[PDB]
Amino acid sequence: PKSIYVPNKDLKISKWIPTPKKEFTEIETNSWYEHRKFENPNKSPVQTYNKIVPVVPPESIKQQNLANKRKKTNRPIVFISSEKIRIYPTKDQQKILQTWFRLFAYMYNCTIDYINSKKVVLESGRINVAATRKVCNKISVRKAQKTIRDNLIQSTNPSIMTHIIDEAIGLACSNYKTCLTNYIERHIKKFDIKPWNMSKRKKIIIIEANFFKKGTFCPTVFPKMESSKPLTMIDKTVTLQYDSDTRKYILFVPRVTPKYSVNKEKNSCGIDPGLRDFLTVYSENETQSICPIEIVVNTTKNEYKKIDKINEIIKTKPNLNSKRKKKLNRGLRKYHRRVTNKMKDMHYKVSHELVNTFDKICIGKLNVKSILSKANTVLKSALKRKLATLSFYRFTQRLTHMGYKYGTEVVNVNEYLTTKTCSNCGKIKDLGASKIYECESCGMYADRDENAAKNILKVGLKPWYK
DNA sequence: GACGGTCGGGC
DNA sequence: CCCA
DNA sequence: AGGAGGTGGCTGCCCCGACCGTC
RNA sequence: AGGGGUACAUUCCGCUAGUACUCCACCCUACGGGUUAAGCAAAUGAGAAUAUCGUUCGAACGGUAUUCUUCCAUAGAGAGUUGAUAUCAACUUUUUAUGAGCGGGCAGCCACCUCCU
Ligand SMILES: [Mg+2]
Ligand SMILES: [Zn+2]
């Protein structure tokens, strides 16, 4: 790929590209981040057509079709999306739930040990993935581990439900299958399913849908349960998680979203992520700049300050009583979680804005691993933290999910020569950190980020990947 | 004697 | 080669 | 070195028939 | 004045805003002050409980693990407690009303990576 330039008129894209100096009209964000806009002086009329949403992800389509292969029930393909229903178990119910978490972890560990003990290696240390997968069958492992499973169940007076422990065995088998799939695909050279300890910090117990009856789950032992919403309409297997850091019992119920009809505007977009502007949106009838890093610093100034000071305290002041060390670790996790929550909320709100404004998003594929790698020092370690906490890849995940949830096709594009390539004439110029992109051939005076976003849009409407 | 709840396995 |  | 956290990647998001408890 | 933390009917997970409480420098004089001082180890606290052990005298002190509490606001009424003259001021509690808008798909595992020191 010697050039990623396709003349705009080939793509029916107006050559409009704003000057780097503009007057930006702010967009209300209801969030910490700042969103700006610059309406094109000359705009084509906005189209519109009827769409049925949510759109089911292709991977979810495959998953549900395969789940229908075992003829569980001939149910229509649906768009699943979790939901956080908080529980308020009592002291007794809290103790029972903790014991059930312990038994779930113990069965998970036993299943992992069973698989490893029966894991078969192909001649050499290489794992014969097919045979190990067959060993990872939930039915076979459940039958084989009946004695150990029964002993585990018959060891606590509020004995866990057999069907929950079977869910634990299935989860262990699925995780081993995940690692095996990674192995065969060479995504990991070796793996080791670490046992679940008492300090896992995030304990999960999977509850079958059938157990959700009479406004509770497992009524035989939990006759009554407090929850944010009624538990009378759950129809899919649920996972109950306890977060020691947050001390919150939460049900991640995968709920069904009924498909309805909406009006979507034909507005192809392009996004060039990075630093100094988290997302520079360019659209044929509009240009937007999202979350400049100055406000990012201002919001994260406190969190980074506290994180650094806690780390320095831990290191430079050793031989601290574990109580103090544990408190410092708790605070560190709290401030990291605050940063993560800020970033997640910005991601979700920005995705909402973009999908509701555009029906097709061509976002750049910023390989954060390559950028963060210590191999290149072109970005200092101080900024590498900001790029890391910005969590661009998680943003891409959430944006893709939102686009599915609102019928917006979030295409992924690799930004290669986007910054260098001229959007108008196609001259390839290296500039470095310069904000202003001024082509010497065609004379375009365009902001660099906006030009990169336009290039991303152009390649997205006709990528060369095939 | 007839409705729910969990258990046993199904692939 | 994207980040500056 | 000892703690964060990320980045990608993959797998899930069950069910019908017996058998038993209660009326 | 500026900054941090905690809580907030408003289903829950959060973000923003706001509100309320609390905390952030030196000299002490060192339980009351000034500095004009913006304080940046400000919950990274504080307190209670469970233990398992070592020491001092069953208690305390220490670790090593856990856990649990750290307050919704304003306005109007009811009740209770305290001070002052059945009435006024302060505190606890029941109750009526009002109390911003924006999103929300996650769980688990793995390998690798960055960061702070
Ligand atoms: Mg770019
Ligand atoms: Zn040019």
Coordinates of N, CA and C (backbone and C1' of nucleotides) in Angstrom, one line a residue, chain A residues 30-32 81-82 84 88 175 179 188 190 192-194 200 228 241 247-248 252 302 305-306 309-311 313 315 321-322 324 334-335 338 341-342 345 348-349 369 372 374 381 401-402 405-406, chain E residues 3-7 11-16 40-49 62-70 101-117:
Chain A
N30 N -23.0 17.0 28.9 CA -23.5 16.5 30.2 C -22.4 15.7 30.9
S31 N -21.2 15.9 30.6 CA -20.1 15.1 31.1 C -18.8 16.0 31.2
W32 N -17.8 15.4 31.8 CA -16.5 16.1 32.0 C -15.9 16.5 30.7
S81 N -28.1 -7.9 25.8 CA -27.2 -6.9 26.4 C -27.5 -6.9 27.9
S82 N -26.4 -7.1 28.7 CA -26.5 -7.3 30.1 C -27.2 -6.1 30.8
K84 N -27.4 -4.4 35.0 CA -26.8 -4.5 36.3 C -28.0 -4.3 37.4
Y88 N -29.2 -6.8 47.6 CA -28.9 -6.4 49.0 C -29.1 -7.6 49.9
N175 N -13.6 -21.6 29.9 CA -12.4 -20.8 30.0 C -11.2 -21.6 29.4
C179 N -8.7 -20.5 26.3 CA -7.3 -20.6 26.3 C -6.8 -21.5 25.2
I188 N -1.3 -16.9 22.2 CA -0.5 -17.1 23.4 C 0.4 -18.3 23.2
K190 N 1.9 -19.9 25.8 CA 1.5 -20.9 26.8 C 0.5 -20.2 27.7
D192 N -1.9 -20.8 31.7 CA -2.1 -21.5 32.9 C -3.2 -20.9 33.7
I193 N -4.3 -21.6 33.8 CA -5.5 -21.1 34.4 C -5.2 -21.0 35.9
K194 N -4.9 -19.8 36.4 CA -4.6 -19.7 37.8 C -5.8 -20.1 38.7
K200 N -9.6 -13.4 45.3 CA -9.8 -13.2 43.9 C -10.2 -11.7 43.6
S228 N -32.9 -4.2 43.0 CA -33.3 -2.9 42.4 C -34.6 -3.0 41.6
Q241 N -22.2 -11.3 40.9 CA -20.8 -11.0 41.2 C -20.7 -10.1 42.4
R247 N -17.7 -3.7 47.3 CA -18.7 -4.3 48.3 C -20.1 -4.2 47.7
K248 N -20.3 -4.7 46.5 CA -21.6 -4.6 45.8 C -21.9 -6.0 45.2
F252 N -25.7 -9.5 36.6 CA -25.5 -9.0 35.2 C -26.5 -9.9 34.4
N302 N -6.1 15.1 39.6 CA -6.2 14.7 41.0 C -5.9 13.2 41.1
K305 N -2.3 12.4 40.5 CA -1.6 12.9 41.7 C -1.6 11.9 42.8
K306 N -2.8 11.5 43.2 CA -3.0 10.6 44.3 C -2.4 9.2 44.0
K309 N 1.4 9.6 44.4 CA 1.8 9.8 45.8 C 1.6 8.5 46.6
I310 N 0.6 7.7 46.3 CA 0.4 6.5 47.1 C 1.5 5.5 46.7
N311 N 1.9 5.4 45.4 CA 2.9 4.5 45.0 C 4.3 4.9 45.6
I313 N 4.6 6.5 48.4 CA 4.5 6.2 49.8 C 4.8 4.7 50.1
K315 N 6.5 2.6 48.2 CA 7.9 2.2 47.9 C 8.9 2.9 48.9
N321 N 2.9 -2.0 58.2 CA 2.0 -3.0 58.7 C 1.0 -3.3 57.6
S322 N 0.6 -4.5 57.4 CA -0.2 -4.9 56.3 C -1.5 -4.1 56.3
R324 N -2.0 -0.9 57.0 CA -1.7 0.3 56.2 C -1.5 0.0 54.8
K334 N -9.3 2.4 44.3 CA -10.5 3.3 44.2 C -10.2 4.4 43.2
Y335 N -9.0 5.0 43.2 CA -8.7 6.2 42.3 C -8.5 5.7 40.9
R338 N -12.0 5.2 39.7 CA -12.6 6.5 39.3 C -12.2 6.9 37.9
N341 N -14.0 4.7 35.4 CA -15.4 5.0 35.3 C -15.6 6.3 34.5
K342 N -14.8 7.3 34.7 CA -14.8 8.5 33.9 C -14.6 8.2 32.5
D345 N -17.7 6.3 31.0 CA -18.8 7.2 30.8 C -18.6 8.1 29.6
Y348 N -19.2 6.0 26.5 CA -20.5 5.6 26.2 C -21.3 6.9 25.7
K349 N -21.1 8.0 26.3 CA -21.8 9.2 25.8 C -21.3 9.6 24.4
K369 N -1.1 -0.9 21.8 CA 0.1 -1.6 22.2 C 1.3 -1.1 21.5
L372 N 2.1 2.4 23.0 CA 2.5 2.4 24.4 C 3.9 1.7 24.5
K374 N 7.5 0.5 24.9 CA 8.7 1.3 25.3 C 9.7 1.3 24.1
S381 N 6.9 9.0 28.6 CA 6.2 8.2 29.6 C 5.1 8.9 30.3
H401 N -20.5 -1.8 20.1 CA -21.7 -2.3 20.7 C -22.8 -1.3 20.6
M402 N -22.6 0.0 20.8 CA -23.6 1.0 20.7 C -24.1 1.1 19.3
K405 N -26.4 -1.3 18.8 CA -27.6 -1.0 19.6 C -28.5 0.1 18.9
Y406 N -27.9 0.8 18.0 CA -28.6 1.9 17.3 C -28.5 1.8 15.8
Chain E
rG3 P -10.9 25.0 42.9 O5' -10.0 24.0 43.7 C5' -8.8 23.5 43.1 C4' -8.1 22.4 44.0 C3' -9.0 21.2 44.4 O3' -9.0 20.2 43.4 C1' -7.9 22.1 46.3
rG4 P -10.2 19.1 43.4 O5' -9.8 18.3 44.7 C5' -8.7 17.4 44.7 C4' -8.7 16.6 46.0 C3' -9.9 15.7 46.3 O3' -9.9 14.5 45.5 C1' -9.2 16.8 48.2
rG5 P -11.3 13.7 45.3 O5' -11.7 13.3 46.8 C5' -10.9 12.2 47.4 C4' -11.5 12.0 48.8 C3' -12.9 11.5 48.9 O3' -13.1 10.1 48.7 C1' -12.6 13.3 50.4
rU6 P -14.4 9.6 48.1 O5' -15.5 9.8 49.3 C5' -15.3 9.1 50.6 C4' -16.4 9.5 51.5 C3' -17.9 9.4 50.9 O3' -18.4 8.1 50.9 C1' -17.6 11.5 52.0
rA7 P -19.4 7.7 49.8 O5' -20.8 8.4 50.2 C5' -21.4 8.2 51.4 C4' -22.6 9.1 51.6 C3' -23.6 9.2 50.5 O3' -24.5 8.1 50.4 C1' -23.1 11.3 51.3
rU11 P -34.3 6.6 40.0 O5' -34.9 5.1 40.2 C5' -35.2 4.7 41.5 C4' -35.1 3.2 41.7 C3' -33.6 2.7 41.6 O3' -33.0 2.8 42.8 C1' -35.0 1.4 40.1
rC12 P -31.5 3.3 42.9 O5' -30.6 2.2 42.2 C5' -30.2 1.0 42.9 C4' -29.4 0.1 42.0 C3' -28.1 0.7 41.5 O3' -27.0 0.5 42.4 C1' -29.3 -0.2 39.7
rC13 P -25.6 1.3 42.1 O5' -25.2 0.8 40.7 C5' -24.4 -0.3 40.5 C4' -23.6 -0.1 39.2 C3' -22.7 1.1 39.2 O3' -21.4 0.8 39.8 C1' -23.9 1.0 37.2
rG14 P -20.6 2.0 40.5 O5' -21.2 3.3 39.9 C5' -20.3 4.4 39.7 C4' -20.1 4.8 38.3 C3' -19.9 6.2 38.0 O3' -18.6 6.7 38.2 C1' -21.6 5.3 36.5
rC15 P -18.3 8.1 38.8 O5' -18.6 9.1 37.6 C5' -17.9 8.9 36.4 C4' -18.3 9.9 35.3 C3' -18.5 11.4 35.8 O3' -17.3 12.1 36.0 C1' -20.4 10.7 34.6
rU16 P -17.3 13.3 37.1 O5' -18.2 14.4 36.5 C5' -18.0 15.0 35.3 C4' -19.1 15.9 34.8 C3' -19.5 17.0 35.8 O3' -18.6 18.1 35.9 C1' -21.4 15.9 35.0
rC40 P 0.5 21.5 51.5 O5' -0.2 20.6 50.5 C5' -0.9 19.4 50.9 C4' -1.4 18.6 49.7 C3' -0.3 18.2 48.7 O3' -0.6 16.9 48.2 C1' -2.0 19.4 47.6
rA41 P 0.5 15.7 48.4 O5' -0.4 14.5 49.0 C5' -1.0 14.7 50.3 C4' -1.0 13.4 51.1 C3' -1.4 13.5 52.6 O3' -2.1 12.4 53.0 C1' 0.7 12.7 52.4
rA42 P -3.7 12.2 52.7 O5' -4.3 13.7 52.8 C5' -4.4 14.4 54.0 C4' -5.5 15.4 53.9 C3' -6.8 14.9 53.3 O3' -7.7 14.3 54.2 C1' -6.2 17.0 52.2
rA43 P -9.1 13.6 53.7 O5' -8.9 12.1 54.1 C5' -7.8 11.3 53.7 C4' -8.2 9.9 53.5 C3' -8.7 9.5 52.0 O3' -8.3 8.2 51.8 C1' -10.4 9.1 53.5
rU44 P -8.6 7.5 50.3 O5' -7.5 6.3 50.2 C5' -6.2 6.6 49.8 C4' -5.2 6.0 50.7 C3' -5.3 6.5 52.2 O3' -4.7 5.4 53.0 C1' -3.3 7.4 51.2
rG45 P -4.2 5.7 54.5 O5' -5.4 6.5 55.2 C5' -5.7 6.4 56.6 C4' -6.2 7.7 57.1 C3' -6.9 7.6 58.5 O3' -5.9 7.6 59.5 C1' -8.3 8.7 57.0
rA46 P -5.9 6.5 60.7 O5' -7.3 6.8 61.4 C5' -7.6 8.0 62.0 C4' -9.1 8.1 62.5 C3' -9.5 6.9 63.2 O3' -9.1 6.8 64.6 C1' -11.2 7.5 61.6
rG47 P -8.9 5.4 65.3 O5' -10.3 4.9 65.5 C5' -11.3 5.5 66.2 C4' -12.7 4.9 66.1 C3' -12.8 3.4 66.4 O3' -12.8 3.1 67.8 C1' -13.9 3.9 64.4
rA48 P -12.3 1.7 68.3 O5' -13.5 0.7 67.8 C5' -14.8 0.8 68.4 C4' -15.7 -0.1 67.8 C3' -15.3 -1.6 67.8 O3' -15.6 -2.2 69.1 C1' -16.1 -1.1 65.6
rA49 P -14.7 -3.5 69.5 O5' -15.2 -4.6 68.5 C5' -16.6 -5.1 68.5 C4' -16.8 -6.1 67.4 C3' -15.9 -7.3 67.4 O3' -16.2 -8.3 68.3 C1' -16.2 -6.4 65.2
rG62 P -0.4 -1.3 69.1 O5' 0.9 -1.9 68.5 C5' 0.9 -2.7 67.2 C4' 1.8 -3.9 67.3 C3' 1.6 -4.9 66.2 O3' 2.2 -4.5 65.0 C1' 1.7 -6.0 68.3
rG63 P 1.5 -3.5 63.9 O5' 2.0 -4.1 62.5 C5' 1.3 -5.2 61.9 C4' 2.0 -6.5 62.3 C3' 1.6 -7.7 61.5 O3' 2.3 -7.8 60.3 C1' 1.5 -8.2 63.8
rU64 P 1.6 -7.5 58.9 O5' 0.8 -8.8 58.6 C5' 1.5 -10.1 58.4 C4' 0.5 -11.2 58.4 C3' -0.8 -11.0 57.6 O3' -0.7 -11.1 56.2 C1' -1.3 -11.9 59.7
rA65 P -1.8 -10.4 55.2 O5' -2.9 -11.5 55.1 C5' -4.2 -11.1 54.8 C4' -5.2 -12.0 55.4 C3' -6.7 -11.6 55.5 O3' -7.4 -11.7 54.3 C1' -6.1 -12.5 57.6
rU66 P -7.7 -10.5 53.3 O5' -8.8 -9.7 54.1 C5' -10.1 -9.9 53.9 C4' -10.7 -10.7 55.0 C3' -12.1 -10.3 55.5 O3' -13.2 -10.7 54.7 C1' -10.6 -10.8 57.3
rU67 P -13.6 -9.9 53.4 O5' -13.5 -8.4 53.8 C5' -14.7 -7.7 54.1 C4' -15.4 -8.2 55.3 C3' -16.3 -7.2 56.0 O3' -17.6 -7.2 55.4 C1' -14.9 -8.2 57.6
rC68 P -18.0 -6.0 54.4 O5' -18.8 -5.0 55.4 C5' -19.9 -5.5 56.2 C4' -20.0 -4.8 57.5 C3' -20.1 -3.3 57.5 O3' -21.4 -2.9 57.2 C1' -18.5 -4.0 59.1
rU69 P -21.6 -1.5 56.3 O5' -21.4 -0.3 57.3 C5' -22.3 -0.2 58.4 C4' -22.0 1.1 59.2 C3' -21.6 2.3 58.4 O3' -22.8 3.0 57.9 C1' -20.0 2.0 60.1
rU70 P -22.7 4.2 57.0 O5' -22.0 5.4 58.0 C5' -21.8 6.7 57.5 C4' -20.5 7.2 58.1 C3' -19.6 8.0 57.2 O3' -20.1 9.4 57.0 C1' -18.3 6.5 58.4
rG101 P -34.2 17.4 34.8 O5' -32.9 17.1 34.0 C5' -32.2 18.1 33.3 C4' -31.1 17.6 32.4 C3' -31.5 16.4 31.6 O3' -30.9 16.4 30.3 C1' -29.7 15.8 32.9
rC102 P -31.4 15.3 29.2 O5' -30.1 14.7 28.6 C5' -28.9 14.9 29.3 C4' -27.9 13.8 29.0 C3' -28.5 12.4 28.8 O3' -28.9 12.3 27.4 C1' -26.7 12.2 30.3
rG103 P -29.4 10.9 26.9 O5' -28.0 10.1 26.6 C5' -28.0 8.7 26.6 C4' -26.6 8.1 27.0 C3' -26.6 6.7 27.3 O3' -26.5 5.9 26.1 C1' -25.5 7.8 29.0
rG104 P -27.5 4.6 25.9 O5' -26.9 3.5 26.8 C5' -25.6 3.0 26.7 C4' -25.0 2.4 27.9 C3' -25.7 1.2 28.4 O3' -25.3 0.0 27.8 C1' -25.4 2.7 30.2
rG105 P -26.3 -0.8 26.8 O5' -25.9 -2.3 26.9 C5' -26.3 -3.0 28.0 C4' -25.2 -3.7 28.8 C3' -23.9 -2.9 28.8 O3' -23.3 -3.1 30.1 C1' -23.5 -5.0 27.9
rC106 P -22.0 -2.2 30.5 O5' -20.8 -3.2 30.1 C5' -20.1 -3.9 31.1 C4' -20.8 -5.2 31.5 C3' -20.0 -6.3 32.1 O3' -19.6 -6.1 33.4 C1' -21.6 -7.2 30.5
rA107 P -18.2 -6.7 33.9 O5' -18.4 -8.3 34.0 C5' -19.3 -8.8 34.9 C4' -19.3 -10.3 34.9 C3' -17.9 -11.0 34.8 O3' -17.3 -11.1 36.1 C1' -19.2 -11.9 33.1
rG108 P -15.7 -10.8 36.3 O5' -15.1 -12.2 35.8 C5' -15.6 -13.5 36.3 C4' -15.2 -14.6 35.4 C3' -13.7 -14.6 35.0 O3' -12.8 -15.0 36.0 C1' -15.1 -15.1 33.2
rC109 P -11.4 -14.4 36.1 O5' -10.5 -15.3 35.1 C5' -10.6 -16.7 35.1 C4' -10.1 -17.3 33.8 C3' -8.7 -16.7 33.4 O3' -7.6 -17.3 34.1 C1' -10.2 -16.7 31.5
rC110 P -6.3 -16.4 34.4 O5' -5.5 -16.5 33.1 C5' -5.2 -17.7 32.5 C4' -4.9 -17.6 31.0 C3' -3.8 -16.6 30.7 O3' -2.5 -17.2 30.9 C1' -5.6 -16.1 29.3
rA111 P -1.3 -16.5 31.7 O5' -0.4 -15.9 30.5 C5' 0.1 -16.7 29.5 C4' 0.2 -15.9 28.2 C3' 1.0 -14.6 28.3 O3' 2.4 -14.8 28.1 C1' -1.1 -14.1 27.3
rC112 P 3.4 -13.9 28.8 O5' 3.2 -12.5 28.1 C5' 3.7 -12.3 26.7 C4' 3.1 -11.0 26.1 C3' 3.7 -9.7 26.7 O3' 4.9 -9.4 26.3 C1' 1.3 -9.6 26.5
rC113 P 5.8 -8.3 27.1 O5' 4.9 -7.0 27.1 C5' 4.8 -6.2 26.0 C4' 3.8 -5.0 26.2 C3' 4.3 -4.0 27.2 O3' 5.2 -3.1 26.7 C1' 2.0 -4.5 27.5
rU114 P 6.3 -2.4 27.7 O5' 5.5 -1.2 28.4 C5' 5.0 -0.2 27.5 C4' 4.0 0.7 28.2 C3' 4.4 1.4 29.5 O3' 5.2 2.6 29.3 C1' 2.4 0.3 29.9
rC115 P 6.1 3.2 30.4 O5' 5.1 3.5 31.6 C5' 4.3 4.7 31.5 C4' 3.4 4.8 32.7 C3' 4.1 5.0 34.0 O3' 4.4 6.4 34.2 C1' 2.5 3.3 34.2
rC116 P 5.7 6.8 35.0 O5' 5.2 7.7 36.2 C5' 3.9 7.5 36.8 C4' 4.1 7.1 38.3 C3' 5.5 6.9 38.8 O3' 6.1 8.2 39.1 C1' 4.1 5.1 39.5
rU117 P 7.7 8.3 38.9 O5' 8.4 7.7 40.2 C5' 8.1 8.2 41.5 C4' 8.0 7.1 42.5 C3' 9.3 6.3 42.8 O3' 10.1 7.0 43.6 C1' 7.5 4.8 42.5

